[PDB]
Amino acid sequence: GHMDEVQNRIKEILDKHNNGIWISKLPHFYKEFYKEDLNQGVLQQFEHWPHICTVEKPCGGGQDSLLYPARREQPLKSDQDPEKELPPPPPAPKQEVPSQGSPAVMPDVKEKVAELLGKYSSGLWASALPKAFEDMYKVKFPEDALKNLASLSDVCTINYISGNTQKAILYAKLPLPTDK
DSSP states (O other): OOHHHHHHHHHHHHHHHOSOEETTTHHHHHHHHHOSOOOTHHHHHHHHOTTTEEEEOOTTTSSOOEEEEGGGOSSSOOSOGGGTSOOOSSSSGGGSOOOOOOOOOOOHHHHHHHHHHHTOTTOEETTHHHHHHHHHTTOOOOHHHHTOHHHHHHHEEEEEESSTTTEEEEEEOOOOOOOO
8 A cells, every 4th residue: 555545644634624725735734744745746636636635716715725625525426316316207297298389280170080080990981971970079060071072081091992983981091290
């Protein structure tokens, strides 16, 4: 052992004193206590040591610094901080969705169709789409909404049976391209 003893004696004086020592008075303090001529390089040790002391520039020092003892060790260098308390994901529970944005153009007729398609693994067949519309939402509404196969093709995959455009089926297409 050697450098560990130099380390431990500077924390010993500074801890015993509690009130730190000015860097200019440190060398004669060291000479008095440990009977040795402090080399100038040990000042550089004092500047870098995280476990022995802290160099401080109190406002009254002006042109020199105080060596406080190691009580200020390990301030925010835990290297385990992400798991010391591991807080929940959001900024706070009141902010569970930091993101913001708006939905797509989906008027009530599109919404009726889109949910209605969602209710059936069978899809809705060309006649069953009107029947299920009127039954489920308890409405009797314009043929402009329930016979306009094109608007239904905006909300649904429309595909045919018995021939091209001979009989029709609807499956969900549920357009929601909006990301913001």
